Amino acid sequence: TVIVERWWKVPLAGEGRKPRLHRRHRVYKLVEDTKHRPKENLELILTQSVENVGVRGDLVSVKKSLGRNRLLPQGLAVYASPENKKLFEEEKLLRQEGKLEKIQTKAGEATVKFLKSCRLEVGMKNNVKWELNPEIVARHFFKNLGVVVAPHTLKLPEEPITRWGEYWCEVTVNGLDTVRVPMSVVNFEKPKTKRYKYWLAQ
Amino acid sequence: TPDEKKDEIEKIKAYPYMEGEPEDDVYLKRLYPRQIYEVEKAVHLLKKFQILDFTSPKQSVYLDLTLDMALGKKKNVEPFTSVLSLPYPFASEINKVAVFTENASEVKIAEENGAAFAGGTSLIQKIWDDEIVADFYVAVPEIMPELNRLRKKLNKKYPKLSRNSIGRDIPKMLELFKNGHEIKVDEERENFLQTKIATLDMSSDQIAANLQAVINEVCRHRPLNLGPFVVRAFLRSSTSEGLLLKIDPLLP
Amino acid sequence: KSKSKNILVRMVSEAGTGFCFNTKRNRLREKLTLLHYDPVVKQRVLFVEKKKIRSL
Amino acid sequence: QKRREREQHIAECMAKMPQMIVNWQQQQRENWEKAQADKERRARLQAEAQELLGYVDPRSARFQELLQDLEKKERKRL
Amino acid sequence: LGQIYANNDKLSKRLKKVWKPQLFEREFYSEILDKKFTVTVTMRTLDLIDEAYGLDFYILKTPKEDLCSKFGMDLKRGMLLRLAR
RNA sequence: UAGGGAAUAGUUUAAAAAACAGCUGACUUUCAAUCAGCAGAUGGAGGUUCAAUUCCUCCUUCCCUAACCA
RNA sequence: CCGAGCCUGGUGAUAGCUGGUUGUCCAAGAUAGAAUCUUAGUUCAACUUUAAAUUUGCCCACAGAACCCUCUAAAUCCCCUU
RNA sequence: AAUUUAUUAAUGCAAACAGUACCUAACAAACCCACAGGUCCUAAACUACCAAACCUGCAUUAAAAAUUUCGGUUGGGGCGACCUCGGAGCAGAACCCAACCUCCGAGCAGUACAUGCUAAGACUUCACCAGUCAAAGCGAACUACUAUACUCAAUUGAUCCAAU
Ligand SMILES: [K+]
Ligand SMILES: [K+]
Ligand SMILES: [K+]
Ligand SMILES: [Mg+2]
Ligand SMILES: [Mg+2]
Ligand SMILES: [Mg+2]
Ligand SMILES: [Mg+2]
Ligand SMILES: [Mg+2]
Ligand SMILES: [Mg+2]
Ligand SMILES: [Mg+2]
Ligand SMILES: [Mg+2]
Ligand SMILES: [Mg+2]
Ligand SMILES: [Mg+2]
Ligand SMILES: [Mg+2]
Ligand SMILES: [Mg+2]
Numbered sequence: 001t002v003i004v005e006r007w008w009k010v011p012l013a014g015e016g017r018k019p020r021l022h023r024r025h026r027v028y029k030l031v032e033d034t035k036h037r038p039k040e041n042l043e044l045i046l047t048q049s050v051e052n053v054g055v056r057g058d059l060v061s062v063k064k065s066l067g068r069n070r071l072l073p074q075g076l077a078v079y080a081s082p083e084n085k086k087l088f089e090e091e092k093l094l095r096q097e098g099k100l101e102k103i104q105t106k107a108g109e110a111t112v113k114f115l116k117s118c119r120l121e122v123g124m125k126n127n128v129k130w131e132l133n134p135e136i137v138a139r140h141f142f143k144n145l146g147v148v149v150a151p152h153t154l155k156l157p158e159e160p161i162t163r164w165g166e167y168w169c170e171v172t173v174n175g176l177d178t179v180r181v182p183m184s185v186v187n188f189e190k191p192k193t194k195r196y197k198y199w200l201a202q
Numbered sequence: 203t204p205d206e207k208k209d210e211i212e213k214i215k216a217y218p219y220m221e222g223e224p225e226d227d228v229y230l231k232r233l234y235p236r237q238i239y240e241v242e243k244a245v246h247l248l249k250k251f252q253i254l255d256f257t258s259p260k261q262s263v264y265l266d267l268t269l270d271m272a273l274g275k276k277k278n279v280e281p282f283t284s285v286l287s288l289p290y291p292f293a294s295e296i297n298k299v300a301v302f303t304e305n306a307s308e309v310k311i312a313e314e315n316g317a318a319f320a321g322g323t324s325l326i327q328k329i330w331d332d333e334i335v336a337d338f339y340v341a342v343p344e345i346m347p348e349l350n351r352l353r354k355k356l357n358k359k360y361p362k363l364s365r366n367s368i369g370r371d372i373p374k375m376l377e378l379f380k381n382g383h384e385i386k387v388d389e390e391r392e393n394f395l396q397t398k399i400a401t402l403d404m405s406s407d408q409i410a411a412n413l414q415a416v417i418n419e420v421c422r423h424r425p426l427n428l429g430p431f432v433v434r435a436f437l438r439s440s441t442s443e444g445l446l447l448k449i450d451p452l453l454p
Numbered sequence: 455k456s457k458s459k460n461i462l463v464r465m466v467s468e469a470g471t472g473f474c475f476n477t478k479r480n481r482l483r484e485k486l487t488l489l490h491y492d493p494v495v496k497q498r499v500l501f502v503e504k505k506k507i508r509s510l
Numbered sequence: 511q512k513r514r515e516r517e518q519h520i521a522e523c524m525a526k527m528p529q530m531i532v533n534w535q536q537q538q539r540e541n542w543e544k545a546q547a548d549k550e551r552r553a554r555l556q557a558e559a560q561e562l563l564g565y566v567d568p569r570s571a572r573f574q575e576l577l578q579d580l581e582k583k584e585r586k587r588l
Numbered sequence: 589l590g591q592i593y594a595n596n597d598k599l600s601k602r603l604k605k606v607w608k609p610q611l612f613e614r615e616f617y618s619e620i621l622d623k624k625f626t627v628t629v630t631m632r633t634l635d636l637i638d639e640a641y642g643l644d645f646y647i648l649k650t651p652k653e654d655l656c657s658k659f660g661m662d663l664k665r666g667m668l669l670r671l672a673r
Numbered sequence: 674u675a676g677g678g679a680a681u682a683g684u685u686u687a688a689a690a691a692a693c694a695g696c697u698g699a700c701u702u703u704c705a706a707u708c709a710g711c712a713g714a715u716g717g718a719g720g721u722u723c724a725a726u727u728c729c730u731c732c733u734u735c736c737c738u739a740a741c742c743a
Numbered sequence: 744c745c746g747a748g749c750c751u752g753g754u755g756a757u758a759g760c761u762g763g764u765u766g767u768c769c770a771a772g773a774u775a776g777a778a779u780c781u782u783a784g785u786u787c788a789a790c791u792u793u794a795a796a797u798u799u800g801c802c803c804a805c806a807g808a809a810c811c812c813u814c815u816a817a818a819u820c821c822c823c824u825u
Numbered sequence: 826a827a828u829u830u831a832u833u834a835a836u837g838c839a840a841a842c843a844g845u846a847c848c849u850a851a852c853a854a855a856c857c858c859a860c861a862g863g864u865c866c867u868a869a870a871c872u873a874c875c876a877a878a879c880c881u882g883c884a885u886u887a888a889a890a891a892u893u894u895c896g897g898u899u900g901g902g903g904c905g906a907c908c909u910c911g912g913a914g915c916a917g918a919a920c921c922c923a924a925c926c927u928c929c930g931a932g933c934a935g936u937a938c939a940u941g942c943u944a945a946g947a948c949u950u951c952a953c954c955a956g957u958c959a960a961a962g963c964g965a966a967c968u969a970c971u972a973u974a975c976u977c978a979a980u981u982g983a984u985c986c987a988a989u
Contacts, residue, residue: 001632002607002882004590007598027591027602033882035610035631035840042638065842068634073615079641107226107233114230127856127863128256139254142231143443143868150227164861173228187861191868192851199849217871232872257864264867343724358688364727394870436869444869455932465938468530470516470523477938484718485732487534491939495520496964498939500530508674594829601892603831610840610881630881631840 001035004028042067044077045084053106057088108174111147115171115179118145123188124164132161132185137169161185203276210392214268214433219446239448241413244437245406251442252402260293261402261440263409268434269420271393275428281387282365284422285378288412292401297380301372302326302341302349302361308372315377323348330355338384340367340376385419393433395420402439413437417452460510465501467492475501478510551577616643620667627659 007027013019041061046053050071053060059080062071071077078084094100104112122140124130134154141147155170167183189197218235238244252259272278301312304322312320319325319336322345328334329352341349341361346368353360361367366374385397397416400409421431432453436444461481467473471494479486485503492499552573559569590607594600609630617624619642640646647655647663655661 001609001630004607007593026589027593028605029592029596030607030883033839035882064634064638068614068638069842073617079638081641084641105226107224107229110233111226111228111230125256125858125863126861127858130256136254139251146231148229148231153227171228174226188863189861190851190863192849193862193868194851195849196851197849200851201849214870255868261865262867264869266867266869268870353690363724370723396867396869398867434870438867438869440865440867442868446870459934468523469527470519475938482733486938488938489531489534491941491965493941495524498965499524499527500534501938506674592831594831601829601831603829605831608881612841612880 002033003031005031039064043080044071045080045088046071046077048076049109050076051110054109055106056103057092058106059085102176104174104176108177112173112177112179114145115147115173115181119182119184120144120169122183122185124185125188130162132156137183203273203278207272207278211270211273211433217434236446238445241410241437241447241449241452242406244445244447245409247445248402248437248439248442251439255441257441259403262292262294263399263402263437263439264396265399265413265416266436266438266444267395267397267416267420267432268393268436269395270429270431270433271387271391271395271423273429274424274426279424280364281391282423283384283386284419285375285382285384286415286419286422287378287381288383288399288415290400290404290408290412291381291383292398292404292412294398296337296383298337299376299379300325300336300339301376302339302345303372304345304348306342306344308342308370312372312376315373316380317372317376326352338367338375338379340372340374342370342372343368385416399437413447414452417449421453458509462507462510463503464505464507465490466504467494467499467501469495469499471495476507477503479503481509618643618647618663618667620644620670621663625663 005028006025007029008022008024010019010021010025042064043059043061044067046056046058046060048054048056052062060077062077067077072079091100095102120137120140121144122132122137123144124132130136134151134156137156138149138151138154141149149171153172155172157167157169159167161167164185164187167185169181169183171179171181173179219239220235220237221239223237224234238247248263252261271281297316298318299316300319301308301317302322302325303309303312303320309320309322319334321328326345326348339356339359339361346361349360383398385395388394388396399416400412404412417432424431432449435447435449437447438444459481460478462476462478463486464474465477465486465488467490469492471492473492473494475490477486477488486501487503488501489498490501491497492501555573555577556566556570559573560566563569590605591602592605594603609632611628611630612634613626614629614634615624615626616637636650637643637646640649644667647660647667650660652661655664
């Protein structure tokens with residue numbers, strides 16, 4: 001929006017009268033064009049799940065382009081009006097205490113999708129005798145797959161693993177979804193050696 | 203303030219960071235900022251990783267410090283090497299120092315203070331005509347004219363007044379070097395300083411004290427309150443990832 | 455219209471009163487320090503040149 | 511407050527003035543004695559040089575430089 | 589439709605100048621009418637619709653002098669007639 | 674005028690060095706080139722520091738950028 | 744009557760330029776200059792006209808007003824009296 | 826020639842509108858490990874690309890035009906010359922006095938730093954504007970540098986506005 005102001009003063013008209021406009025009062029200066037202003041975010045309440053944010057009832061501040069051109073037209077989100085906030089707020093209470101079941105958080109859904117399609121390379125050193133336990137296996141998610149897994153969540157095959165081979169790790173994400181990821185125990189190779197050996201070679 | 207250098211300083215400050223583990227039990231690292239802070243917990247955690255990742259109980263903790271070594275004024279400071287011994291020097295033994303002093307009583311003071319290589323023309327000629335390696339060099343003003351021969355050989359590593367390595371009193375760097383540990387500087391001058399602090403087996407409190415000593419040691423170059431000298435601190439073991447310490451309380 | 459041999463400068467009182475007067479000096483010579491009467495304090499005080507007004 | 515600060519500033523600046531004048535007066539006398547020294551020395555050296563060579567930038571520059579060196583050599587000894 | 593001074597200096601030439609709004613074709617859905625409309629709008633209209641929490645609220649809340657559109661007033665009569673009946 | 678930046682041998686650069694010029698010569702018919710030597714500098718002033726091109730300050734000259742309206 | 748048509752309107756365009764400006768009778772009444780895109784005009788002085796106030800105006804005796812330089816000019820200024 | 830780019834075209838930015846990819850140069854000196862490889866002497870940190878047009882706003886460069894003016898003096902005008910200020914002659918003796926008349930100059934410099942303040946009475950370039958000289962007084966200076974409105978002939982520029 002173009003906002004303008006007059007160069008010349010307009011004489012006061014008084015109460016109940018229209019201003020007397022000379023032709024000099026048509027000369028304007030551009031005060032501001034509001035399209036050049038810093039863009040503000042649009043506050044929406046989500047309905048379905050989206051990769052960025054997916055917790056139904058989560059107050060999200062998105063770019064006006066995203067909300068207007070995708071979320072709102074398709075119904076994935078609704079306006080954060082006082083009436084909508086009340087309805088979604090009430091539903092939250094029921095989920096916490098009522099019959100309504102609890103649902104993954106925004107990050108929980110992202111991890112579950114990643115955990116469904118990933119394989120862990122549990123690199124173990126040959127020299128030192130090693131026994132695989134939840135704590136050690138948890139460390140490899142951080143290093144290899146980049147997932148930060150709590151030690152208690154991991155459920156190992158319960159058979160002591162001291163030999164290179166394949167097994168299965170059952171990961172529980174926030175206590176609701178249990179994912180079983182393939183486990184590939186392999187001889188440990190240092191980061192520099194492994195990258196130079198294969199990544200550089202091929 | 204060159205755009206690239208100053209912009210990165212703004213960018214590194216921008217990197218978000220958070221306190222405490224997120225509510226979610228299992229969370230992708232990408233989804234949340236850096237979290238681990240406290241220096242005490244950091245050392246305790248580095249010991250934990252050593253057990254999980256089977257490795258030597260004693261490892262060099264190569265603390266890397268992204269210390270704002272620039273932007274005092276719009277003119278940036280320069281990289282130097284303030285050498286000071288930590289409260290508990292780790293078990294590494296380093297005693298490599300060359301002292302240039304010819305036909306002077308300083309020859310005695312040099313060796314008396316633990317000089318490894320002390321000599322005059324004979325020592326200077328040996329450096330030019332034959333290969334020899336020393337960690338740091340010192341020379342008295344009287345020998346600087348003769349020592350100029352090795353200026354080209356040492357590629358600006360020869361003694362300079364800027365590094366306080368030219369003076370009648372040699373023990374500035376000579377004496378403190380053996381117990382002292384050099385605060386080397388980056389080659390790219392990106393402001394990250396790789397400086398070992400302690401062995402992994404050193405007690406947390408001793409490593410914590412060793413950390414604080416360096417904080418004052420590093421600010422010695424520019425201890426002015428005009429420009430902040432410290433931005434981030436990554437305490438990493440030899441075979442572990444760096445952890446973002448909460449160094450703000452320990453800065454002053 | 456001719457070679458600029460002199461310049462006009464502002465002499466500021468050292469008494470802190472802020473009284474100023476303009477004097478002409480040679481461009482090449484050093485900054486003037488003069489003993490000039492200051493009306494605010496009503497006695498002669500040392501003045502020191504601070505700025506160059508214009509070229510004469 | 512503004513009035514009190516201005517009067518205090520003037521009073522302080524005016525208590526130092528008596529000594530300032532003494533220093534200024536001495537500088538004038540010192541400058542009078544320095545100009546005489548220059549008037550004498552520069553003229554003699556420059557005049558003799560000009561008479562010999564050419565009956566004068568090069569010669570003047572030399573004498574205007576060596577004299578400075580002599581003063582510096584004394585400062586180096588200090 | 590107005591005038592301007594060249595270089596924003598009153599002592600310079602006075603020139604004619606027209607400032608036009610940036611126009612966009614967007615699709616909106618009306619709950620009361622259960623129909624989608626492709627309408628030319630400005631970024632201001634989109635902001636006003638967001639502040640009203642939907643097209644229907646914007647059409648019903650906005651007075652005639654602020655809508656400044658015969659089509660907008662036709663939508664209002666349509667929406668009001670469905671609510672009245 | 675305004676701030677920013679800059680000032681090194683006669684000249685142009687470097688972190689107190691090299692290159693050219695001046696070259697004193699040698700050698701080329703002549704001259705260039707080439708070889709070996711020799712002279713050569715930290716704009717000016719003041720101060721700190723044992724020591725300041727390398728810390729600071731004022732002034733001169735020049736550049737840059739923006740003025741240079743009435 | 745095209746160096747850019749014609750008509751109406753703005754329009755009683757503007758013109759320091761030219762022309763014109765209507766009954767009777769009497770009276771006073773001519774002229775240093777300055778500035779100005781100003782010298783075909785203006786504004787201020789000067790002159791001129793009317794009314795009012797109160798007091799000198801004009802004509803002029805002595806005495807008096809420069810050296811430097813050549814015409815040692817005709818004269819002027821000042822000025823009581825009358 | 827001065828002023829201008831609204832208009833037209835081009836270019837840049839913003840506005841508007843998709844997503845796409847997330848980065849590898851060991852090497853054991855010693856020791857371990859049947860291998861494949863590991864322990865020590867660092868295995869950190871770090872996201873980067875990035876949406877064609879039309880339209881709208883703001884800039885820049887062009888094109889094509891628009892608006893307005895084109896000083897005076899002058900033995901007619903043009904050309905040449907001249908245009909403000911001071912000294913001398915013409916103008917012999919109070920003042921004043923012209924020519925595209927006759928001659929010479931000025932657009933500073935130097936010394937002070939009370940070239941501080943204030944105030945009777947006067948002069949005046951024929952108006953106005955501007956310009957000029959000043960007793961006393963205040964404050965200084967002073968113990969006789971022809972001293973307290975510097976020397977100098979002209980040595981210069983109104984109002985608005987701008988900088989402070
Ligand atoms: K006229
Ligand atoms: K006629
Ligand atoms: K004639
Ligand atoms: Mg016709
Ligand atoms: Mg008419
Ligand atoms: Mg008559
Ligand atoms: Mg004029
Ligand atoms: Mg006339
Ligand atoms: Mg009489
Ligand atoms: Mg003109
Ligand atoms: Mg004419
Ligand atoms: Mg003629
Ligand atoms: Mg002419
Ligand atoms: Mg007069
Ligand atoms: Mg007097």
